[PDB]
């Protein structure tokens, strides 16, 4: 309707209810995180700290997931079983990952209660990532000892990263257990991340799907595609900032080097996906802990199959972790092909033009003759516009289902991004 009517309704109709909903759904989790933070600072024995965070994680899983949380509980116990029967092998990663894969597949069979499994898939993904990462860290020799039962459980049920929180390596959780002083930088990080979480939530809900009609005089197929993409991106950024605010409030999420404690846990970078340089930087800046996990474990293990095969295996692992579904396997396959073609085409262009057009910011150690000016700037802006166009075309599916909905939404856009990537690959092959 009218723009003046919409901006009259804006403040009290959407911005206050959305912020109230967010605060109401995160207040108890934040209270429990602060409770464990204050408890772990008193100086209890380590096993009491691990037991306390097991209890806190049980209560958080109950509060969010009423009684179906038992599924997640199984995923923990099973994992420890698989980490106790092969504690002496160099296959800990292989066995834990195969167990996780079998579990998630037998969950995808929809014989279990389907309505709530799709709700718990987030916490289950976090727990599975944690177990696989601990297995592979013990394999490679980065964790010295196989953890005791209570240490492993307090790691999986860490109340800061149980529901939303990102994956943190076993040693990050151990140092979180050790505790740090409550300096003002910690409170600054927690408050900044909470404020940005609420801002991203209200932007996704009450500023994103009403952008081009009201917030811009522009208003269509591509406009609604861009609006859906922006709304989904900012919902994900809400979840990311909330995850880092709840993992920094609990104690974890810090990096120290030579007596310099700096709380710098970052889960997502909105300024690298909303003003992108390339699709590689988009898939890397979308979720930094999950990108690190995928890259390190899956990619560095499957790097024998070849570069492209390893990239496809990484995107298949991502599709499995996030739950197999058409409009997600299709998006992830399109991302695989888009990032591959763009990366390799930009690499050949940077080798031929001897300029800095690499899919990422190259440093001052370049072999590149053209570093600044206008041609480099113009080409990088062209590729950034291409990345925004790809993001719109891909996120158009998550408006505001099955094969029919995906084909419909991608035919309404005349299959633009796929033809663009195909032409880019042809141009790559012609010049090299």
């Amino acid at each position: 309707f009218s723009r003046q009517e919409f901006f009259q309704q804006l403040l009290q109709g959407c911005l206050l209810p959305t912020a109230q909903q967010g605060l109401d759904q995160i207040w108890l989790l934040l209270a429990i995180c602060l409770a464990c933070r204050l408890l772990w600072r008193l100086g209890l024995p380590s096993y009491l700290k691990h037991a306390s965070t097991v209890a806190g994680g049980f209560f958080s899983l109950y509060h969010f997931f009423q009684l179906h949380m038992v599924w997640v509980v199984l995923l923990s116990l099973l994992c420890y079983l698989v980490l106790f029967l092969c504690r002496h092998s160099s296959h800990r990663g292989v066995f834990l990952s195969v167990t996780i894969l079998i579990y998630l597949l037998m969950g995808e069979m929809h014989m279990v209660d389907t309505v709530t499994w799709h709700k718990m898939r987030g916490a289950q993904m976090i727990v599975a990532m944690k177990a696989v990462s601990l297995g592979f860290d013990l394999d490679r020799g980065e964790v010295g000892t196989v953890p005791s039962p209570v240490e492993f459980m307090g790691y999986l049920y860490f109340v800061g990263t149980i529901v939303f929180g990102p994956w943190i390596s076993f040693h990050s959780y151990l140092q979180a257990v050790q505790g740090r002083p409550l300096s003002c930088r910690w409170l600054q990080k927690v408050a900044r991340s909470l404020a940005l979480a609420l801002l991203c939530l209200v932007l996704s809900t009450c500023v994103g799907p009403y952008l081009f009609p009201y917030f811009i005089p522009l208003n269509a197929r591509w406009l609604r595609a861009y609006e859906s993409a922006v709304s989904f991106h900012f919902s994900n950024y809400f979840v990311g900032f909330l995850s880092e605010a709840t993992a920094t409030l609990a104690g974890a999420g810090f990096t120290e080097e030579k007596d310099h404690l700096e709380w710098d846990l970052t889960v997502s970078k909105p300024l690298n996906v909303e003003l992108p340089r390339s699709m590689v930087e988009v898939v890397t800046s979308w979720n930094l802990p999950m990108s690190y996990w995928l890259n390190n474990y899956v990619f560095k293990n499957a790097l024998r199959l070849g570069t492209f095969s390893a990239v496809l295996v990484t995107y298949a692992a991502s599709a499995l972790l996030h739950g197999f579904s058409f409009h997600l396997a299709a998006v992830l396959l399109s991302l695989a092909f888009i990032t591959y073609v763009e990366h390799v085409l930009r690499k050949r262009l940077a080798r031929i033009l001897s300029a800095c057009v690499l899919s990422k910011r190259c440093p001052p150690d370049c072999s590149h003759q053209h570093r600044l000016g206008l041609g480099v700037r113009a080409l990088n802006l062209l590729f950034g516009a291409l990345a925004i166009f790809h993001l719109a075309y891909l996120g158009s599916l998550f408006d505001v289902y099955g094969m029919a909905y995906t084909v419909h939404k991608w035919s309404e856009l005349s299959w633009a991004s796929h033809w663009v990537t195909f032409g880019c690959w042809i141009f790559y092959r012609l010049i090299g």
Partner: antibody
Framework: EIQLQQSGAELVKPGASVKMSCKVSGYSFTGYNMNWVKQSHGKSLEWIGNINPYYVSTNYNQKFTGKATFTVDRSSSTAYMQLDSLTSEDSAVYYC????????????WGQGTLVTVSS | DIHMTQSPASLSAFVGETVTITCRTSENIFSYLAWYQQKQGKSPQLLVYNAKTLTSGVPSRFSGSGSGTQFSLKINSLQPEDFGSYYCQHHYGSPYTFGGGTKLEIK
């Protein structure tokens, strides 16, 4: 009985490269990380790195990266470490030590290979 | 990485006496420490792991203790086969560092 038979001593010219060897007998070669450790003459021990024989991924000490490279041979169940550009300070005794399964404490050690760099 | 300060550098006693070696850790390692014994000319042997657990074969007179950043190894009734160098090595996580050593001799 576990036994890590480690190759003989080497006398290398400065700037050249050396390649130790550690033949494992007594257990499944691809079931435990193989650690490589360096000890100066009468000084403390230094953990060069390790190699996982199942998947050949290695894990180096940053002080020894680019200096030592680990390889394996499952057909002969033998782990090799190659040192590159041996300075006069690389004359030491190098041990191969198997991890104690669960822990990464070095349960079974070799006998040591003496690397001496001179002219 | 983690720096391990082992003390004393030298230590001498009589056959049957009791000695104690200390290992201070630069960081907190959650009682992840091993004690190795290396005699004159041989390779080290793992005596203690997890800062408290004796291995299969080592006599019961070796006693490990400590936690956090302070650990100790106590040897009661020194026998002639117990005089060598002793190294404390953390197995918290890579890179695993050792201690300076403690040359136990007879005087």
């Amino acid at each position: 009985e576990i036994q890590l038979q480690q190759s003989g001593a080497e006398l290398v010219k400065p700037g050249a490269s050396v390649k130790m060897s550690c033949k494992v007998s007594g257990y499944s070669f691809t079931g435990y990380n193989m650690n490589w450790v360096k000890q100066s003459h009468g000084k403390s021990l230094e953990w060069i790195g390790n190699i996982n024989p199942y998947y050949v991924s290695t894990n180096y000490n940053q002080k020894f990266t680019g200096k030592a490279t680990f390889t394996v041979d499952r057909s002969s169940s033998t782990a090799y470490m190659q040192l590159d550009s041996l300075t006069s300070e690389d004359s030491a005794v190098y041990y191969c030590a198997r991890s104690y399964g669960s822990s990464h404490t070095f349960a079974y050690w070799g006998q040591g290979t003496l690397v001496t760099v001179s002219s | 990485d983690i720096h391990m300060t082992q003390s004393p550098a030298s230590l001498s006693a009589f056959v049957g006496e009791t000695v104690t070696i200390t290992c201070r850790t630069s960081e907190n390692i959650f009682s992840y420490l091993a004690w190795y014994q290396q005699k004159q000319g041989k390779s080290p042997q793992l005596l203690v792991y997890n800062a408290k657990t004796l291995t299969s074969g080592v006599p019961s007179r070796f006693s490990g203790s400590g936690s956090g950043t302070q650990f100790s190894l106590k040897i009661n009734s020194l026998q002639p086969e117990d005089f060598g160098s002793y190294y404390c090595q953390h197995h918290y996580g890579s890179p695993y560092t050792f201690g300076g050593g403690t040359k136990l001799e007879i005087k």
